[PDB]
Design a protein around this ligand. Structure first.
Ligand SMILES: [Ca+2]
Length: 143
């Protein structure tokens, strides 16, 4: 037989997606999804808070920036987060996001650690108002 080769389909990273009644709630929800890649997010208690503020020229960059700062907090302080309060406004020609992130220190016995997220990316990123008036935010982070 002559040697032969092929490509085949396999999972590549993982998709995260949030839905909400508002853009802000979709951002909150997809951030929960992000932490559920790393731990069982349902096991994360709200003991500590960190605040985020970022500006961007468009909503995609805003979402990237928000999630990447959450990842950085996670990487530096070892915090994991359960929920978020997000506010998005227009200020002097930019989008401004402010958020409160609620969570606690990683607990290896309790949080059911899964896999770390290496980086937020723009891969498959989409933010949209669906025909039914709900909002969706998604992306495929690098794991
Ligand atoms: Ca990867």
């Amino acid at each position: 037989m002559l040697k032969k080769w092929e490509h085949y389909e396999h999972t590549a990273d993982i998709g995260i997606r949030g839905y909400g009644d508002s853009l802000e709630e979709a951002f909150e929800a997809v951030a929960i999804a992000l932490f559920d890649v790393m731990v069982n997010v349902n096991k994360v208690e709200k003991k500590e808070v960190r605040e985020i503020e970022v500006e961007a020229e468009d909503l995609e960059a805003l979402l990237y920036s928000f999630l990447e700062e959450l990842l950085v907090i996670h990487d530096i302080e070892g915090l994991v987060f359960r929920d978020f309060e997000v506010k998005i406004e227009r200020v002097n020609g930019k989008y401004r996001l402010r958020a409160k992130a609620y969570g606690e220190k990683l607990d290896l016995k309790k949080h059911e650690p899964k896999e770390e997220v290496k980086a937020i990316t723009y891969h498959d990123m989409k933010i949209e108002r669906l025909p039914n008036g709900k909002w969706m935010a998604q992306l495929v982070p690098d794991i």
